[PDB]
Amino acid sequence: IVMSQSPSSVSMSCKSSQSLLYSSNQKNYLAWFQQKPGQSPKLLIYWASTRESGVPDRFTGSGSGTDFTLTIYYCHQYYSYYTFGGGT
Amino acid sequence: IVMSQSPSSVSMSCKSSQSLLYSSNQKNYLAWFQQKPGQSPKLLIYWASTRESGVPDRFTGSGSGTDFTLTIYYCHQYYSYYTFGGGT
Amino acid sequence: AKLETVTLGNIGKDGKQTLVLNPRGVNPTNGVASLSQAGAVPALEKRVTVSVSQPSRNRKNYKVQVKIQNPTACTANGSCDPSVTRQAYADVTFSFTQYSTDEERAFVRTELAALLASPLLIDAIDQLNPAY
Amino acid sequence: AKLETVTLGNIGKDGKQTLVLNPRGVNPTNGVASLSQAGAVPALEKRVTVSVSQPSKNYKVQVKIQNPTACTANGSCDPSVTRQAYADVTFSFTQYSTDEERAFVRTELAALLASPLLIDAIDQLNPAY
Amino acid sequence: AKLETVTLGNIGKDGKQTLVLNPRGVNPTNGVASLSQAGAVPALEKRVTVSVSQPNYKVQVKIQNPTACTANGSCDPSVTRQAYADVTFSFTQYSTDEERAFVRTELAALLASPLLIDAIDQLNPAY
Amino acid sequence: AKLETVTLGNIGKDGKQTLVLNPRGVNPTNGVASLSQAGAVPALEKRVTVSVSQPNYKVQVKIQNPTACTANGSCDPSVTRQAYADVTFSFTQYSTDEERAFVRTELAALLASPLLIDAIDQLNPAY
Amino acid sequence: AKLETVTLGNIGKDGKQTLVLNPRGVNPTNGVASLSQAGAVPALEKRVTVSVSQPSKNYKVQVKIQNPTACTANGSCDPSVTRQAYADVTFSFTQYSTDEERAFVRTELAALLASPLLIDAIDQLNPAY
Amino acid sequence: AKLETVTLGNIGKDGKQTLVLNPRGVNPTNGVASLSQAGAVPALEKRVTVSVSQPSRNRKNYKVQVKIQNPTACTANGSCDPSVTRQAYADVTFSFTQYSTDEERAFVRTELAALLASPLLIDAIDQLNPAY
Amino acid sequence: KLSCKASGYTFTTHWMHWVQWVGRIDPNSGNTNYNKATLTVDKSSSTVYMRLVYFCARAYDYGPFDYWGQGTT
Amino acid sequence: KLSCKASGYTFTTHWMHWVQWVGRIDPNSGNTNYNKATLTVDKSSSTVYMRLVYFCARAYDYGPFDYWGQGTT
């Protein structure tokens, strides 16, 4: 499947092709990344809501299947295809 | 033993020297191969009838001992001598 | 409901883990639906079993039972195939009167599911420290 | 850890219910630590009990919860108890078990209690077919 | 077959309401499959049981619909009354499929005839 | 009501054949109304009996279809075997018309569902 | 897997015979799943039963088939049964067995049942000398 | 027939396998013909045994019995020669009345040989999932 | 021939991933999944080899990419 | 010195074959069958060495050649 998101121009939004709820629970399979242009990408949010420890509380992500957003940067699925999304 | 088949000129036919039924069942020991001139040979049919998974259904092979054919390419025995047969 | 593959996400100590359970059919002798993980060597498989018991002449009380079992494998010295060393069990039993509404049963289920994530339970199960 | 107030959130079928549990000490005869509802009469309260054991074979962890349904008494001023809703959990671990295995078992059970299979076989009592 | 959710439709006195049954497991002791509704309290709930026997072959179906009031004294609702139906077929070991299908389809057509909707609904004995 | 000729249609395994019943008088001793086919010898003939009781109210319906061979020795045909069905409803004296119509229409809809056409025709026990 | 219709092909000595088996449910007292002939009276039908077991030592798999010979009755209209032809298969595997070993055993048995030795010691009952 | 080497082709899970069985002679004490695979260490050999029993005064019924046994070897830790860890058995028993024709026996044999290849049996034997 | 050495956890778990997504391997049974470039594993040194900026990351079977290795250019 | 590395299955089975038929080896007991060119086996790396287009294939004792390796020229 293909993953698309908003252009380089706060609240970002990433949208996948088909649904992303693969679990019997209500858990999505999206991850958010950021990188300084001279460093490796850093995991920000996994399960689309968990806010991995070690990140400031300002990064709050939310969203159901096919409609995800990040409030105040790559969007990546990690279940089947492991494809990223080009964006600022 | 020696294995021969039809010239480079559909239904091909490969013929061995002696019989090829070596099993107590009614199973032959012939295999069919094909290769693109820049790739490794690919197994098409084994036991002369099984049509290995991953090949189109158009390749239907049949034949009893010493008389084998392939309908719409090397013929190879894989029991004792592992010798091939020159042909198109 | 119908037995289907059950995919559980956000599990494990760190919360970054998945467990896919494939159905194995309902046993007609005792009415126990079984779920198992996809593997060979049937002695090295995760197992989950759920069952519901109607009130008979002796019980007269609904009972829901859930059992999970996780074996661990270790290739011992001088041995070729892996064996089973330790077993980890967990047994859950619910009891509901015939006049129990849906709200009570849902409340009990969600209360248990939320208790199993409080710091008291994670400390008493992960580290085995008694509640003191 | 320590017996503090446990404020469970998002309880119930609708997903918006809270339960506040206060400590009630530890029984010195069997070591069971108790938790009870916040503002309920001691005869109409929701109870939770946990206790761990030690070998003398395997470590046994047991959690018991109990929920009575207090109907408003027709004549009397003291509402009685009509029904009880029980739920029991029993973990069992070998003395050589690591922390990851036990945490995996606990989180697996917590995730199972939210799958459609269990929410259908517990809320509506329909066995899996 | 295998127990699955069963959704009867068009049933009722007027033919509008529908009823959905949910399987509830075969009883191992006597092999009595069970089906029950989904909604109400487990003690106030319509249920259906079918049990094919083995040797003469016996097929027995039971249905009961309990109706509950709310007693003034108590908050809990109690079973005021319930209505039963007990259908039991009996076949010989030499009977064919066409003979057994005739009985079931004939019985299922009598219950939709004016003879039996005036002898069960209005309770008029046939004379 | 009053006994009249009853013409069930669409019955059968395939749903094409039809069956016509003819009234044969209420038995005075127990008030069991009777209906029977028209064609065959009186001893080789499908018959239906319905008897509404009075006090709990009981409605009981019986149907039997006898199948006959021609024995080699004799010219007369004998009853080789027959298949029975015994439907019995039971209602309370306080039951309304809408409760009794629900049971009859629910039972008449179970017999046309895959649960019971695979447990009577092919005799597969439900599990 | 699932109890569906099993259409066996190329049965018989001549190699051109078909048998169609319909499911007949699972016995809830011992878990044996049954299969029976398509259009046969329940007293003159070919039966097949399979069932697997679980340790409580080894996993036991058992397959039983049964074939009656229904002679046309001389006087009566109901053909009776004269003879029965039984065949029983019993697999036994350790709980540590892989899938390849069990598949190898099954395919080895299926290939043996077609060798000249067995087709001569089963069709004509000549012991191997 | 006569005991000869039996070569079985198209066996195994994938269908690409052969098994050559050499004769080992007929036991005169109980009339059991034995076939074995060519190897050393007689405890690590595949075995196949067939036997037919005539109707005696007690049985009065023909019986054909086929047994196959496959042991597996594993070189354990701190050991030099391989041992046997697991055993895999399969027991087949036929029963035929004295008046059973050839057609019935051939039908039974071929029916069993075709059942052992249906998806139901491959799922119930390879994966041990009960037929549900 | 690009190498990635993992230290700080048991190497047998945690499928190793490569991103410019390229591929993945499992240090148990050596299962591979590709998107010209092959991968091998070394048990003793706990190193992942990439035969031909390339990043090296590890994750569970269905989990997120936790830690990312540095590039090689 | 031509090498052939097998990955994706247990190396102990599956006699390894070489075709321009040339020869075969068994990764258990090192049995060889030749048609000037010798073969050796390496247990640790699961590699077959061919001492002197050459193809590398694997098959059972009496089965067909399933997978063919690439040539070396």
Q: What is the CATH number of the domain that holds F15?
A: 3.30.380.10
Q: Which residue has the tokens 């989904």?
A: E38
Structure tokens at H66: 């086929």
Could you tell me if D39 and D21 are in contact, meaning their C-beta atoms sit under 8 angstroms apart?
Answer: no
Which of A24, A46, A47 lies at the smallest CB-CB distance from C7? Answer: A24
- Tokens representing residue E74 in the block: 């108590």
Residue J50's φ and ψ, nearest 5 degrees, are -115, 105
| Interface contacts E/F by beta carbons within 8 Å | 242
User: Could you give the CA distance from residue B79 to residue B61 in angstroms, rounded to a whole number?
Assistant: 18
Q: Is-contact B12 B6, C-beta < 8 A?
A: yes
G57 DSSP 8-state letter: -
Sheet bearing I16-19, strands edge to edge: I32-34, I23-25, I16-19, I55-58, I67-68
Amino acid at G4: E
- Among residues G36, G68, G39, G37, the alpha carbon closest in space to that of G49 is found at G36
Check CB contact of A51 with chain C, cutoff 8 Å. Answer: no
J17 half-sphere exposure, CB direction, 13 A CA radius: 23
φ, ψ dihedrals at H125, nearest 5°: -105, -45
Q: Which of G22, G28, G42 sits opposite F127 (nearest CB)?
A: G28
Instruction: Report the distance separating Cα C23 and Cα C38, nearest Å.
Output: 10
Contact B25 G117 (CB under 8 A): no
- Mapped onto helix, strand or coil, the DSSP state of residue G37 is strand
Report how far residue E19's alpha carbon sits from residue E33's, in angstroms, rounded to the nearest whole number: 18
Distance of CA G81 to the CA centre of its chain: 19
User: What are the chain C neighbours of H78 within 8 Å (beta carbons)?
Assistant: 77-78
Strands ordered across the beta sheet of G59-70? G6-8, G19-26, G33-37, G47-52, G59-70, G81-93, H83-96, H62-74, H47-53, H32-37, H18-27, H6-9
DSSP lists the bridge partners of residue F83 as F65
Residues in chain H: 132
Measured in angstroms, the CA of J11 and the nearest CA of chain H are apart by: 16
Q: Answer whether H10 sits within 8 Å of B22, measured CB to CB.
A: no
- Longest Cα–Cα distance in chain A: 39
Is E2 strand, coil or helix?
coil
The angle subtended at Cα B20 by Cα B15 and Cα B25, nearest 5°, is 140
Q: Which of H96, H117, H128 sits opposite G110 (nearest CB)?
A: H117
| The one-letter amino acid at D37 | Q
- Secondary element (H or E) of residue E60: strand E57-70
Closest CA to C1 of I57, H21, D123: D123
| Minimum Cα–Cα distance from J18: chain B residue | B82
Whole-number Cα distances in Å, H56 to H51, H100, I72:
15, 17, 83
Q: Write out the residue range of the structural domain in which residue H123 sits.
A: 1-132
Find out whether F56 and F68 touch, Cβ atoms under 8 Å: no
Residue F110: enclosing H or E segment and its boundaries?
helix F97-110
The residue assigned the tokens 């709980």 is G95
Kindly list the residues from chain G whose CB atom is less than 8 angstroms away from the CB atom of residue E52: 25
Closest-CA distance of chain F to residue G20, Å: 14
Pick from E26, E34, E43: which is nearest to C98 by CB?
E43
Exposed, middle or buried by CB within 10 Å (0-12, 13-18, 19+), for F39?
Answer: exposed
CA atoms within 13 A on the CB side of E37: 17
Cα–Cα–Cα angle for G110, G113, G115, rounded to 5 degrees: 115
d(CA F101, CA F1): 16
- CB-side exposure of I32: number of CA atoms within 13 Å? 17
**CA separation for the pair G128, E59 (Å, rounded):** 50
Identify whether the C-beta of residue B23 lies closer than 8 Å to the C-beta of residue H8.
yes
* Farthest-apart Cα atoms in chain I, separation: 31
DSSP-based three-state secondary structure for H9? strand
Shortest alpha-carbon distance between residue J18 and chain B (Å)? 10
Question: What's the token pair of residue C111?
Answer: 């209360």
Scored b (16 or more CB within 10 A) or e, J56-70 reads bbbbbebbbbbebbe
The interaxial angle of helices C102-115 and D116-123, nearest 10 deg, is: 140
Q: Give the total residue count for chain F.
A: 127
d(CA J33, CA J23): 6
Structural tokens at position H130:
């009960």
Within 8 A by CB and 6+ apart from A9, the residues are A88
Q: Three-state SS across I8-56?
A: CCCCCCCCEEEECCCEEECCCCCCEEECCCEEEEECCCCEEEEECCCEE
Buried b (16+ CB within 10 A) or exposed e, F72-102: eeeeeeeebbbbebbbbbbbeeebeeebbbb
Instruction: Compute the distance between CA of residue I61 and CA of residue I69 in angstroms, rounded to an integer.
Output: 18
CB E107 within 8 A of CB E116: no
DSSP per-residue codes, E13-51: SSS---EEEEE---BTTTTBEEEE-SSS-TTS--EEEEE
Are the CB atoms for B19 and B75 separated by under 8 Å?
Answer: no
Q: Residues of D with CB below 8 A from E72's CB?
A: 74
Residues H50/G122, Cβ–Cβ less than 8 Å: no
E42 and C62 within 8 Å at the Cβ level: the answer is yes
Give A82's contacts (C-beta < 8 A, 6+ positions apart): A76, I17, I21, I24
CB atoms within 10 A of CB H60: 9
With beta carbons under 8 A apart, name residues in chain G contacting F69: 77
CA distances from G57 to B14, C46, C70, H72 (A): 53, 19, 19, 18
Question: Residues of G numbered 17-76 whose beta carbons fall under 8 angstroms of chain F's beta carbons: which are they?
Answer: 22-26, 28, 42, 75-76
Name the one residue in this structure whose structure tokens are 């399960």.
A47
Q: Which residue has the tokens 């064609």?
A: F39
Centre a 10 Å sphere on the Cβ of residue G80 and count the other Cβ atoms it contains.
14
Return d(Cα C118, Cα E1) in angstroms, integer: 45
Mutation site, C4, C7, C22, C116, interface A, largest A CB count within 10 A: C7
CB count within 10 Å of CB G94 equals 18
CA G77, G78, G82, G87 torsion-angle sign: positive
Resolution (A): 3.3
- Establish if B79 touches chain J: CB-CB under 8 angstroms: yes
User: Is there a contact between B59 and B52 (Cβ–Cβ < 8 Å)?
Assistant: no
Number of other residues whose CB lies within 10 A of the CB of residue I44: 6
Phi-psi region of E6 (alpha: psi -120 to 50; beta: other; left: phi over 0): beta
Tokens standing for residue E116: 């039996």
Nearest residue on chain G to C27, alpha-carbon basis: G31
Among G68, G61, G69, which Cα is nearest to G33's?
G61
Closest of C45, C50, C20, C46 to residue C33, by C-alpha: C50
User: Could you tell me the two tokens for C84?
Assistant: 């089973």
SS3 C26: strand
What is the C-alpha separation between A46 and A33, in angstroms, rounded? 9
Residue numbers after which chain F is interrupted (C to N above 2.5 A) read: 55
- Whether the CB-CB separation of H122 and G103 falls below 8 Å is answered with yes
| Helix axes of G116-123 and H102-115: crossing angle, nearest 10 degrees | 140
Within C7-132, where are the H helices?
102-115, 119-126
Out of G3, G29, G42, closest to residue E93 by CB: G42
Q: How many angstroms separate the CA atoms of F6 and E112, rounded?
A: 11
> Is H18 strand, coil or helix?
strand
Structure tokens at A18: 């088909």
**Looking at the complex, does the CB of residue C80 fall below 8 Å from at least one CB of chain H?**
yes
Distance CA(C104)–CA(D84), nearest Å, equals: 10
Do B27 and H15 make contact, defined as CB atoms within 8 angstroms? no
CA atoms within 13 Å, Cβ hemisphere of E88:
8
**Cα H110 to Cα G9: distance, rounded to the nearest angstrom:** 9
Residues sharing a CB contact under 8 Å with residue G87, sequence separation 6 or more, in sequence order: G64, G65, G66, H92, H93, H94, H95, H108, H109, H111, H112
Q: Map chain D to HEC letters.
A: CCCCCEEECCCCCCCCCCEEEEEEEECCCCCCEEEEECCCCCCCCCEEEEEECCCCCCEEEEEEEEEEEECCCCCCCCCCEEEEEEEEEEEEECCCCCHHHHHHHHHHHHHHCCCHHHHHHHHCCCCCC
The answer to whether the CB atoms of C54 and E27 lie below 8 A apart is yes
Residues written for chain B: 88
Nearest to D78 by CA among D42, D47, D46: D42
Pairing verdict, β F47-52 and F57-70: antiparallel
Task: Give per-residue burial for G27-47: e unless 16+ CB within 10 Å, then b.
Answer: bbeebbbbbbbeebbbbbbbb
State phi, psi for G102 to the nearest 5 degrees: -70, -40
Q: Subunits with at least 3 CB pairs below 8 A relative to chain A?
A: C, D, I
Burial class (CB in 10 A: 0-12, 13-18, 19+), F51: buried
Query: Residue D122: left (phi > 0), alpha (psi -120 to 50), or beta?
Result: alpha
Q: Identify the CA nearest to F126 among candidates B11, D92, E1.
A: E1
Determine whether C14 is exposed, middle or buried from the number of CB atoms within 10 Å of its CB (0-12, 13-18, 19+): middle
**Residue whose C-alpha is closest to residue G73's, from F81, F72, E55, H99:** F72
Helix axis angle, D99-112 to C119-126, nearest 10°: 140
In chain I, which residues touch A (CB < 8 A)?
A: 17, 19, 21, 24, 55, 59, 62-66, 68-71
Place of tokens 């009186």: F42
- Residue H30: DSSP 8-state: T
Identify which of B70, A22, D97 has the alpha carbon closest to the alpha carbon of residue C86: D97
Sign for the pseudo-dihedral over CA of B63, B66, B70, B76: positive
Name residues whose C-beta falls within 8 Å of residue G13's C-beta, 6 or more positions apart in sequence.
Answer: G123, H102, H103, H106, H107, H110
Angle at H7 between CA H2 and CA H9, to 5 degrees: 145
Amino acid present at B44: L
| J and H touch per CB criterion (3+ pairs under 8 A) | yes
Please tell me the distance from the alpha carbon of residue D47 to that of residue B24, in angstroms, as a whole number. 72
Of H77, H86, H128, the CB nearest to C78: H77
Number of C-beta neighbours around residue C49 at 10 A = 18
Q: In angstroms, what separates the C-alpha of I60 from chain A's closest C-alpha? A: 10
Which long-range contacts (C-beta less than 8 Å, at least 24 apart) are formed by I36-40? I40/J7
Q: How far, in Å, CA of D31 to CA of D29, rounded?
A: 6
What does DSSP assign to residue E126?
A: P
Min Cα distance E27 → chain G (Å) is: 8
Find the CB nearest H8 among B25, B29, B47.
B25
Rounded to the nearest 5°, which phi and psi values hold at D106?
Answer: -65, -45
Which tokens go with G27? 């016995």
Alpha-carbon distances, residue F110 vs E20, F10, F104, F122 (angstroms):
11, 17, 10, 16
Chain-centroid distance of CA I24 in Å reads 6
Half-sphere exposure (CA, 13 Å, Cβ side) for G22?
Answer: 16
- Between CA H31 and CA H25 the distance in angstroms is 10
Based on the structure, what is the number of domains in chain G? 1
Asked how this structure was determined, the answer is cryo-EM
Helices (H), chain A: none
> Are chains A and J in touch, 3+ Cβ pairs below 8 Å?
no
Residue of F nearest to E85 (CA): F89
Residue keyed to tokens 């148990």: I28
| Nearby residues of F42 by Cβ (< 8 Å), 6 or more positions away | none
